[PDB]
Scaffold this active site. Structure first.
Site, PDB file in Angstrom:
ATOM      1  N   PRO A 204      -3.089 100.677  32.245  1.00  0.00           N
ATOM      2  CA  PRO A 204      -1.581 101.790  31.843  1.00  0.00           C
ATOM      3  C   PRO A 204      -1.450 102.871  30.928  1.00  0.00           C
ATOM      4  CG  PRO A 204      -1.255  99.319  30.483  1.00  0.00           C
ATOM      5  CD  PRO A 204      -2.612  99.982  31.755  1.00  0.00           C
ATOM      6  N   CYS A 205      -2.928 103.201  30.802  1.00  0.00           N
ATOM      7  CA  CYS A 205      -3.663 104.395  30.813  1.00  0.00           C
ATOM      8  C   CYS A 205      -2.836 105.929  31.067  1.00  0.00           C
ATOM      9  CB  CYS A 205      -4.989 104.483  31.390  1.00  0.00           C
ATOM     10  SG  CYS A 205      -5.977 105.879  30.792  1.00  0.00           S
ATOM     11  N   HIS A 206      -1.890 105.462  32.431  1.00  0.00           N
ATOM     12  CA  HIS A 206      -1.666 106.742  33.042  1.00  0.00           C
ATOM     13  C   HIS A 206      -1.013 106.669  33.944  1.00  0.00           C
ATOM     14  CE1 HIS A 206      -3.268 111.078  33.695  1.00  0.00           C
ATOM     15  NE2 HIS A 206      -3.937 111.452  33.073  1.00  0.00           N
ATOM     16  N   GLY A 207      -0.241 105.823  34.613  1.00  0.00           N
ATOM     17  CA  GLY A 207      -0.200 105.649  35.976  1.00  0.00           C
ATOM     18  C   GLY A 207      -1.347 105.046  36.758  1.00  0.00           C
ATOM     19  N   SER A 208      -2.833 104.956  36.141  1.00  0.00           N
ATOM     20  CA  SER A 208      -3.547 104.400  36.841  1.00  0.00           C
ATOM     21  C   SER A 208      -2.811 103.069  38.036  1.00  0.00           C
ATOM     22  CB  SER A 208      -4.606 104.468  36.360  1.00  0.00           C
ATOM     23  OG  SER A 208      -5.000 105.434  34.888  1.00  0.00           O
TER      24      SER A 208
END
Ligand SMILES: CCCCCCCCCCC(=O)OC[C@H](COP(=O)(O)OC[C@H](O)COP(=O)(O)OC[C@@H](COC(=O)CC)OC(=O)CCC)OC(=O)CCCCCCCC
Ligand SMILES: CCCCCCCCCCCCCCCCCC(=O)OC[C@H](COP(=O)(O)OCCN)OC(=O)CCCCCCCCCCCCC
Ligand code: HEM
Ligand code: HEM
Ligand code: HEM
Ligand code: HEM
Ligand SMILES: COc1c(O)c(C)c(C/C=C(\C)CC/C=C(\C)CC/C=C(\C)CC/C=C(\C)CC/C=C(\C)CCC=C(C)C)c(O)c1OC
Ligand SMILES: CCCCCCCCCCCCCCC(=O)OCCCOP(=O)(O)OC[C@@H](O)COP(=O)(O)OCCCOC(C)=O
Ligand SMILES: CCCCCCCCCCCCCCCCCC(=O)O[C@H](COC(=O)CCCCCC)COP(=O)(O)OCCN
Ligand SMILES: CO/C=C(/C(=O)OC)c1ccccc1Oc1cc(Oc2ccccc2C#N)ncn1
Lengths: 385, 93, 248, 123, 54, 126, 55, 93, 50
Positions: free
Chosen positions: D87-91
């Site tokens: 859930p960093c980036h939408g990764s």
């Protein structure tokens, strides 16, 4: 003669802080240089007493700093004066360099004095980077990961400079142990450059805020500028004491109280406030090799100013166009620090690219064009032709 | 030791300026003067013109950069709300 | 980022240790330790706090000796070399509920509850964020939000999905001094206890700072008088020019 | 170097190691998911990559996992179709990690793993 | 005259600023601690122990 | 850095043009009044930086009655600056007194140094 | 000692002092060379050397 | 800077000795001399008288201290043997 | 164990020597300790626990 002039060690003291002729019209901006000497003594003395209780192993480094805060008698005073004292060191140094830009102190015959000062500024940046690693907080680990990975983009030697800097395959235990040993050493190299800085100043003396010669009216240093120096020393200590005792974690990041974890990335990786404008310049170049070259060019471009200033007058006191563009450059530097603390998002990406251009165009385009125009306006406003 | 190079400053008695002739100066001892005669006639008029004959060189560059930062901060706030969702896919292309 | 990914902003409450002349409320610290032992300590460790630091702050000397003697610690081996155990003393640190990290994740569905010795200084918001998290669980999430199974909704957590459930309910703790133990009272007391765990020097730092600021203010005001006295001969100096006669 | 032999690796559980300070999210694949990667063609992503350049050997699925930017780690088996998700980036990660289910177009790395006869050596 | 009995003889002008600063430390520390504890009365541990005696 | 020979070449080209001397000359008069050196009792040639060999030659050749008056104006401007005041309005430099007294000595020393440099790095032909 | 005998705080403070004192020695060597420059060196005959010098 | 104090050495041209008159000196270039006429006529006779006109100031103090150390070492060896056991209780009183 | 290779024994001789001793391993997913045979990175073990 008197003993202060005949002794071999006291005549150096007498010709520097007792009998040295000063111009009679210098203002309080000329007091920043002696505050920088007090800051360097404060950082060195609090550094030795903390080093008697510190362990530099990667399993022990975070708990050693917590041991200083809890178990050492007055240990929280030593750390908070050290961490906040580094931020006060950079603020006084920024104002000292901006005084030199405004009054034309870089010009001849003081070019050697300006060049030695640029070396001091580079060594101070490297010192504060290495001390931040020794905490081994979560911002300490990932800030060292980002900066050391920049050097692998150098052609043909890049992948072997980085592993020689790590002592291994990543930021690990040999990295922290060698960074603490380098952190002890570089403040002693800074102290030797300060002595070479004061030798070049003794040859020509100081400038004055009018820009013209000071040889016609001089007063000695002792009891006039000694007591003027005491006013700014006590004001500096009072404001520093308000931060150390009443708000000691305002100028820091709360992620640095989490121990370093190489498996969990923080949501935002932010440097300290005094390195934020150089961080935003690096993020504005998309290519990785050109970004690290532009980041180091932002310091080395200070050396072109003795050659791009074309004016026949030293300083900004009687120039209205140079006054306007000096303060454009000052607020551009504050905006670059604010962009460096934001996410990579629209519209901060384009704003950082325009502000990066304005930084380099001041030294190379704006200063030689404006100072040429001001030479001609002084001429044709007086000459009857 | 050897003699040094040529500089633009000397010492007391041989400071290195032009020759002076015709100028007289006068001074009075600080022990015979009034103690602290400044906060008034200096905060009245002197410490207002010393910066408000200079304020326009500082506040015009300050107003340009504060208008630019405040305008960009409100546009980033619009793009990540519900109403600015459709523009957000367009400008991240 | 959106407002949900950053988290809801925590408001400002009137904590009685806010201000340059305030100390901690030590009765609120003592009630806050009781909420730690009965609620928090089932899953959270307090590893940087020794037993001896509680004496003269929240408990008497024989009260802490009885508290530490209910846990057993490792001892030096005997004359044959086999390990032994011993009850605790004031030199020991407060023990945690799990032997290692893998046993902690196995008891909490893969999530790791962090050590709470520095949690007030390690989050943006401070005491206001810890208080708003504990008293800020809604009865149901807003319409549209689908949480994964095993997580709960809290708007002050970044992202909105947190792996701990609501733990504070009305009258779950019986206090010694007779305070009514509502949800808002127990969250206020344990946040004050956790702020002392992060900043034990707090009451001493503010007393030493008052002596330093008074002394440094007097030296600043005296140096302005002395500088203006010693400069008055230069500041009132006058010059007169008479042009010299030519032919010399 | 890391030497683990072949029979010890399980299929539904993760044997992630921090080898040389790299988190390496790897698996025993078995055959049921070697056709779960040709179904999205190159018509969505920038790299001329196919599964023949991903893996040497379809029995064993191994690829390395830091982050084309900083390095965060995903949650296990919670993905869009058979993958992971930080859930960093939408990764959003698929099987064997092809992003462009979020922002990042580049896919990361294959470690140097080598067989000398029923003996894989990650390094 | 009170210049020549206090600040002329600089065998004790260095001395009196070195001896008046000794008794200055104990009077200053007693006055601030008494003010600081009275401003925070009812919150210290000694005010708590006086009625957790039970 | 920019020579006074180059400044006079650009400036005399503007002053001979009848269209360029209607645009730039009103702007130059506002620029000098906003500079404010005349309110401290200085002429413009007092403000030229002197730590170079050309300016040291021109200051040696100045007649001594003008050298005594230049020294008094510089000293009076330093004393006014440290008091953070301005001069009384009847002691300001007027525009008809702000003449370039040092400029012919500077231009003569610059032309002699240029001719010496051309003769020292020189070609010949048979 | 930092305690009751030679122990762990003794070794940690002795290594930090061991780093520092060679830099104080280097500053005394500079003061040593300044005093030597004033008068010069002596010679093995014990008498004045001002009559015959070589660089 | 200020002028220094009075010393007993100057620099080249003003070294500070007495005035010289009547002395002539001669020298030949090293490029026109024989290479290394050194080891003979110096190890023959020169590097023997340079220390054996000095050897008696060194070897008389060396022989005194070597006789004293060797005599004390043999007495300590006698005291801790079997034959010197009876003297050992007498001199440790 | 790795220091003996190329000095007194070959590489597969030292691998067989180190595999006759067992060392501590990282705990499993429940947190219970495990054992493992030795490798070339390990040090030569002694006969007594303390
Ligand atoms: C960061 C931690 C370091 C702390 C110490 C650093 C101090 C930095 C301040 C910047 C500076 O050094 O320049 C100051 C400059 C004024 O220079 P000036 O010589 O023309 O003014 C002489 C005065 O008329 C007589 O001043 P006087 O000597 O008569 O009295 C002293 C005065 C306080 O003086 C100071 O503290 C100087 C900092 O005492 C009083 O105010 C009496 C009532 C209590 O000010 C200006 O030119 C513009 C004013 C605003 C500058 C702020 C910009 C900061 C970025
Ligand atoms: C690579 C490194 C780059 C370094 C760049 C440094 C940028 C850091 C910002 C430092 C700010 C320092 C600006 C002032 C520098 C001092 C020199 C100066 O400007 O002169 C003082 C100026 C002149 O005043 P006078 O006209 O009365 O005196 C003329 C002489 N007779 O009098 C004035 O006008 C003083 C007004 C000062 C206002 C400046 C506001 C700065 C705000 C910065 C805030 C940063 C934190 C947010
Ligand atoms: C110009 C001089 C110096 C500067 C600018 C500097 C800067 C710093 C900084 C920024 C930190 C991180 C502080 C924090 O955020 O917690 C630090 C840590 C540290 N420094 Fe320095 N330092 C200097 C000199 C020294 C010296 C000379 C020593 C040792 C002899 C030293 C020893 C330490 C130690 C032990 C730490 C870790 C403890 C802590 O975190 O405070 N420092 N330094
Ligand atoms: C530890 C760092 C430093 C110390 C201790 C120091 C010290 C000093 C001192 C005492 C003076 C004379 C008084 C004054 O003008 O304030 C001075 C002048 C000067 N310094 Fe620094 N300085 C430091 C860093 C720098 C830096 C980083 C620069 C520029 C990049 C610099 C450039 C100059 C210049 C140009 C002058 C001459 C100013 C003038 O004559 O008007 N110095 N320095
Ligand atoms: C009054 C009692 C408690 C307090 C004050 C407390 C405090 C906290 C705090 C401050 C956090 C960190 C939140 C953040 O990262 O911003 C946290 C996380 C957590 N706590 Fe609690 N805790 C309490 C009781 C419990 C209990 C009883 C359990 C389990 C049965 C628990 C399990 C967890 C877990 C699993 C997390 C990690 C959640 C995540 O990262 O998503 N806690 N706690
Ligand atoms: C790190 C330590 C030292 C260094 C680098 C050093 C360096 C020097 C040098 C280069 C000279 C001139 C050349 C020579 O005569 O050999 C000299 C002369 C001298 N030194 Fe030292 N020295 C050191 C320690 C000492 C000590 C420990 C003493 C005495 C207690 C001492 C006393 C002298 C004296 C008296 C001379 C003058 C000799 C003469 O002129 O005939 N020095 N030193
Ligand atoms: C233009 O006219 C001027 C002028 O205007 C000014 C301001 C100055 C001002 C001069 C300065 C500001 C001096 C510069 C400051 C320095 C060079 C500081 C150098 C720093 C050091 C020497 C650090 C050394 C510190 C230590 C050795 C402390 C070590 C700690 C110890 C020993 C702990 C004790 C151990 C135990 C076990 C108790 C001039 O000299 C001058 O003349 C040219
Ligand atoms: C009244 C005071 C009250 C309060 C105010 C101030 C209090 C604080 C005191 C300040 C400390 C003293 C002042 C600072 C000082 O003296 O240092 C700056 C001067 C050093 O530079 P220097 O003398 O040019 O170097 C020294 C030089 O001038 C002389 O050359 P040398 O160094 O001999 O070279 C020998 C090296 C040999 O190198 C080789 C061998 O290659
Ligand atoms: C590495 C950077 C070096 C920078 C050098 C800066 C100078 C620092 C010195 C600071 C002031 C020190 C005061 C010295 C006291 C006077 C000197 C003196 O007493 O000399 C002598 C006595 O000799 C000594 O005992 C020296 C004491 C050692 C001092 C070591 C700190 C005084 O007698 P003398 O008549 O010879 O003095 C004239 C010299 N030309
Ligand atoms: C170890 O991490 C150090 C940091 C720090 O701020 O130290 C004081 C840091 C933290 C997070 C992110 C980056 C950090 O470091 C840095 C380092 C840095 O260094 C330079 C500054 C100017 C010019 C070149 C460089 C480089 N390299 N410029 C910006 N941030």
């Amino acid at each position: 003669m008197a003993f202060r002039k005949s002794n071999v060690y006291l005549s150096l003291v007498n010709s520097y802080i007792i009998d040295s002729p000063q111009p009679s019209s210098i203002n309080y901006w000329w007091n920043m240089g002696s505050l920088l000497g007090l800051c360097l003594v404060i950082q060195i003395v609090t550094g030795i007493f903390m080093a008697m209780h510190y362990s530099s192993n990667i399993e022990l480094a975070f708990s050693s700093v917590e041991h200083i805060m809890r178990d050492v008698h007055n240990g929280y005073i030593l750390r908070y004066l050290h961490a906040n004292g580094a931020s006060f060191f950079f603020m006084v140094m920024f104002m000292h360099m901006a005084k030199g830009l405004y009054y034309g102190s870089y010009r001849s015959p003081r070019v050697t004095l300006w060049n030695v000062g640029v070396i001091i500024f580079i060594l101070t940046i490297a010192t504060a980077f290495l001390g931040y690693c020794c905490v081994y907080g979560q911002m300490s680990h990932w800030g060292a990961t980002v900066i050391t990975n920049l050097f692998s983009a150098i052609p043909f030697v890049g992948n072997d400079i980085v592993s020689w800097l790590w002592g291994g395959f990543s930021v690990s235990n040999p990295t922290i142990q060698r960074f603490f040993a380098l952190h002890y050493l570089v403040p002693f190299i800074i102290a030797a450059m300060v002595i070479m800085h004061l030798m070049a100043l003794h040859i020509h003396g100081s400038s004055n805020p009018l820009g013209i010669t000071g040889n016609l009216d001089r007063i000695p240093m002792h009891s006039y500028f000694i007591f003027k120096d005491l006013v700014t020393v006590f004001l500096f200590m009072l404001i520093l004491a308000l931060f150390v005792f009443y708000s000691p974690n305002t100028l820091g990041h709360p992620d640095n109280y989490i121990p370093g974890n190489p498996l969990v990335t923080p949501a935002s990786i932010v440097p300290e406030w005094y390195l934020l404008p150089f961080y935003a310049i690096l993020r504005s170049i998309p290519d990785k090799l050109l970004g690290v070259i532009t980041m180091f060019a932002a310091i080395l471009v200070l050396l072109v100013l003795p050659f791009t200033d074309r004016s026949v007058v030293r300083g900004n006191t009687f120039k209205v166009l140079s006054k306007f563009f000096f303060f454009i450059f000052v607020f551009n530097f504050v905006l670059l620090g604010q962009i460096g603390a934001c996410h990579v998002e629209v519209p901060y990406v384009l704003m950082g690219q325009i502000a990066t251009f304005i930084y380099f165009a001041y030294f190379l385009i704006i200063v030689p064009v404006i100072s040429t125009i001001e030479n001609v306006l002084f001429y044709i406003g007086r000459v009857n032709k | 030791g050897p003699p040094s190079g040529k500089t633009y400053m000397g010492w007391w008695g041989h400071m290195g300026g032009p020759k002076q002739k015709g100028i007289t100066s006068y001074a009075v001892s600080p022990y015979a003067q009034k103690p602290l005669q400044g906060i008034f006639h200096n905060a009245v008029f002197n410490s207002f013109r010393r910066f408000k004959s200079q304020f326009l060189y500082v506040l015009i560059p300050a107003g340009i950069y504060w208008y630019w930062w405040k305008n960009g901060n409100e546009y980033n706030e619009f793009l990540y709300s519900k109403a600015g969702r459709e523009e957000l896919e367009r400008v991240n292309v | 980022m959106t407002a949900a990914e950053h988290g809801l902003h925590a408001p400002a409450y009137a904590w009685s240790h806010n201000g340059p002349f305030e100390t901690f409320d030590h009765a609120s610290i003592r009630r806050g330790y009781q909420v730690y032992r009965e609620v928090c300590a089932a899953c959270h460790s307090l590893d940087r706090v020794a037993w001896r630091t509680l004496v003269g702050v929240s408990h008497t000397n024989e009260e802490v000796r009885n508290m530490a003697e209910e846990f057993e610690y490792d001892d030096e081996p005997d004359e044959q070399g086999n390990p032994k155990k011993r009850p605790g003393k004031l030199s020991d640190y407060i023990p945690g509920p799990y032997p290692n990290e893998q046993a902690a994740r196995a008891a909490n569905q893969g999530a790791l509850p962090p050590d709470l010795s520095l949690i007030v200084k390690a989050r943006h918001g401070g005491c206001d964020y810890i208080f708003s998290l504990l008293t800020g669980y809604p009865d149901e999430p807003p319409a549209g939000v689908a949480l994964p199974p095993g997580s709960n909704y809290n708007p002050y957590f970044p992202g909105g999905s947190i792996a701990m459930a609501r733990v504070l309910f009305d009258d779950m703790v019986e206090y010694e001094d007779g305070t009514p133990a509502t949800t808002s009272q127990m969250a206020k007391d344990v946040t004050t206890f956790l702020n002392w765990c992060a900043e034990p020097e707090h009451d001493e730092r503010k007393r030493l700072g008052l002596k330093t600021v008074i002394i440094l203010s007097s030296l600043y005001l005296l140096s302005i008088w002395v500088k203006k006295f010693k400069w008055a001969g230069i500041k009132t100096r006058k010059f007169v020019f008479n042009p010299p006669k030519p032919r010399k | 170097k890391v030497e683990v032999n072949l029979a010890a690796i399980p299929l539904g559980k993760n044997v992630v190691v921090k080898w040389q300070g790299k988190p390496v999210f790897i698996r025993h694949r078995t055959p049921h998911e070697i056709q779960e990667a040709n179904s999205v063609d190159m018509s969505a992503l920038k790299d001329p990559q196919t599964d023949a350049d991903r893996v040497k050997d379809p029995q064993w699925l191994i690829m390395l996992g830091i982050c084309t930017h900083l390095g965060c780690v995903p949650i296990g088996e919670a993905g869009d179709f058979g993958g992971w998700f930080c859930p960093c980036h939408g990764s959003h990660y698929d099987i064997s990690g092809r992003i462009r289910k979020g922002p990042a177009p580049l896919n990361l790395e294959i470690p140097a793993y080598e067989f000398d006869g029923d003996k894989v050596i990650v390094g | 005259s009170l210049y020549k009995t206090f600040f002329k003889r600089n065998a004790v002008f260095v001395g009196t600023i070195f001896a008046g600063a000794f008794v200055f430390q104990t009077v200053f520390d007693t006055a601030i601690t008494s003010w600081y504890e009275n401003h925070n009365k009812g919150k210290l541990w000694k005010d708590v122990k006086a009625r957790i005696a039970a | 850095p920019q020579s006074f020979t180059s400044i006079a070449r650009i400036g005399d080209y503007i002053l001979k043009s009848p269209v360029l001397s209607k645009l730039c000359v009103p702007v130059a008069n506002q620029f000098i009044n906003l500079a404010g050196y005349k309110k401290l009792g200085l002429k413009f040639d007092d403000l030229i930086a002197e730590e170079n060999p050309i300016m040291q030659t021109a200051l040696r050749r100045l007649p001594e009655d003008e050298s005594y008056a230049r020294a008094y104006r510089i000293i009076r401007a330093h004393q006014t600056e440290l008091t953070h005041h301005l001069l009384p309005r009847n002691e300001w430099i007027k525009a008809q007194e702000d003449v370039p007294y040092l400029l012919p000595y500077i231009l003569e020393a610059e032309a002699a140094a240029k001719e010496k440099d051309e003769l020292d790095n020189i070609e010949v032909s048979k």
